């Protein structure tokens, strides 16, 4: 599924992400845009054997299990395949754990590079939320 | 990513020594820069980790209060200042880094790190 910007903003709001660990809704929409271009099926293989999954590009070295990295961790206690669903719940629930780890949204590289220090509220402007 | 260590060598007990690590390539993709050490008879252990995008720091119990990890992010530099050094600090010190986030609970584990410097001997008298 490729979400529309405003469609995703609404779904993220419904999932309680607005102001979650202090990050306004625009931050979350912007992160999805640059991490996955709003695509719930997005995957990216990394040099360590791990894979980034789904709309928020969550890494299998730490957060989910895909079997392909023996001794890796699964801190969200889910199969990585759950992060490729057309509904965002599993990704959002896992993302909540990630952002609560102690370094905020900096754990998302594309958020740091493309969202942090920008007018993130632009990503939700003009949506009827 | 190449990590280039400098500093080290001999130091007296209760004294101070600064180690430096300079990171190759662009500043932006480095996540953690973290000093490890390996002492006579023991495995490599995490000493002090720094998350470069917030400045947050994490120390092993045996150095809390005596060692300080810090950075100059613009230069891809990380520093370890050892104050109040003790015999147990004698070890080979190596800086590691990652280009992907690592949960804080694993930030002092060597298996978390993908890039390493040379090792720099520190000896406490
Ligand atoms: Cl949904
Ligand atoms: Na990611
Ligand atoms: Na895993
Ligand atoms: Na870099």
């Amino acid at each position: 599924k490729v979400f529309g910007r405003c469609e995703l903003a609404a779904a993220m709001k419904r999932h309680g992400l607005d102001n979650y660990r202090g990050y306004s809704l625009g931050n979350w929409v912007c992160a999805a845009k640059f991490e996955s271009n709003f695509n719930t099926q997005a995957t990216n293989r990394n040099t360590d054997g791990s894979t980034d999954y789904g709309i928020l590009q969550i890494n299998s070295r730490w957060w989910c299990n895909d079997g392909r990295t023996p001794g890796s961790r699964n801190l969200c206690n889910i199969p990585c395949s759950a992060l490729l669903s057309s509904d965002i719940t599993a990704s959002v629930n896992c993302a909540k754990k990630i952002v609560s780890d102690g370094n905020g949204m900096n754990a998302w590289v594309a958020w740091r590079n493309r969202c942090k220090g920008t007018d993130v509220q632009a990503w939700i402007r003009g949506c009827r939320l | 990513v190449q990590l280039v260590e400098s500093g080290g060598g001999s130091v007296q007990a209760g004294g101070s020594l600064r180690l430096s690590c300079a990171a190759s390539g662009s500043t932006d993709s480095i996540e953690y820069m973290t000093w490890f050490r390996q002492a006579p008879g023991k495995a490599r252990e995490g000493v002090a980790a720094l998350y470069t995008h917030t400045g947050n720091t994490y120390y092993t119990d045996s150095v809390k209060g005596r060692f300080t990890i810090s950075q100059d992010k613009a230069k891809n530099m990380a520093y370890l200042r050892m104050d109040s050094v003790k015999s147990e600090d004698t070890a080979i010190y190596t800086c590691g880094a990652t280009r992907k986030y690592v949960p804080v609970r694993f930030a002092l584990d060597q298996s978390s790190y993908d890039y390493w410097g040379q090792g720099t001997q520190v000896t406490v008298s």
Side-chain angles (χ1 to χ4, degrees), chain B residues 76-91:
Chain B
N76 242 354
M77 300 299 300
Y79 304 104
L80 188 64
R81 183 167 156 185
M82 300 168 52
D83 307 292
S84 282
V85 297
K86 292 166 78 183
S87 294
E88 71 196 65
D89 303 324
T90 295

Side-chain angles (χ1 to χ4, degrees), chain A residues 44 46-48 50 52 59 61-63 73 75 98 101-104 106-109 112-113 116, chain B residues 28-32 51 53-54 56 58 99-106 109 111-115:
Chain A
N44 171 89
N46 290 293
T47 62
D48 67 358
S50 67
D52 295 323
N59 194 270
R61 195 157 169 174
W62 308 117
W63 309 102
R73 309 305 188 122
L75 292 187
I98 301 162
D101 191 63
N103 289 300
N106 290 284
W108 285 283
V109 181
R112 301 199 311 268
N113 292 343
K116 184 181 187 182
Chain B
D28 64 298
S29 65
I30 295 193
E31 301 248 5
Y32 282 88
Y51 188 66
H53 299 287
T54 58
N56 288 333
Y58 312 93
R99 300 165 68 203
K100 303 279 268 196
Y101 189 70
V102 174
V104 162
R105 69 193 79 183
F106 308 121
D109 295 333
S111 59
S112 300
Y113 291 84
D114 304 304
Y115 300 110

Side-chain angles (χ1 to χ4, degrees), chain A residues 69-122:
Chain A
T69 52
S72 73
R73 309 305 188 122
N74 176 12
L75 292 187
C76 296
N77 203 27
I78 51 166
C80 299
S81 60
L83 304 169
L84 301 172
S85 54
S86 69
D87 88 285
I88 63 173
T89 307
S91 288
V92 168
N93 288 332
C94 186
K96 290 169 167 182
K97 300 184 198 196
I98 301 162
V99 74
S100 296
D101 191 63
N103 289 300
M105 288 190 73
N106 290 284
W108 285 283
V109 181
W111 178 89
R112 301 199 311 268
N113 292 343
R114 312 293 293 283
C115 302
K116 184 181 187 182
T118 74
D119 184 12
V120 293
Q121 291 300 93

Side-chain angles (χ1 to χ4, degrees), chain A residues 60 64-65 72-73:
Chain A
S60 72
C64 59
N65 182 56
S72 73
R73 309 305 188 122

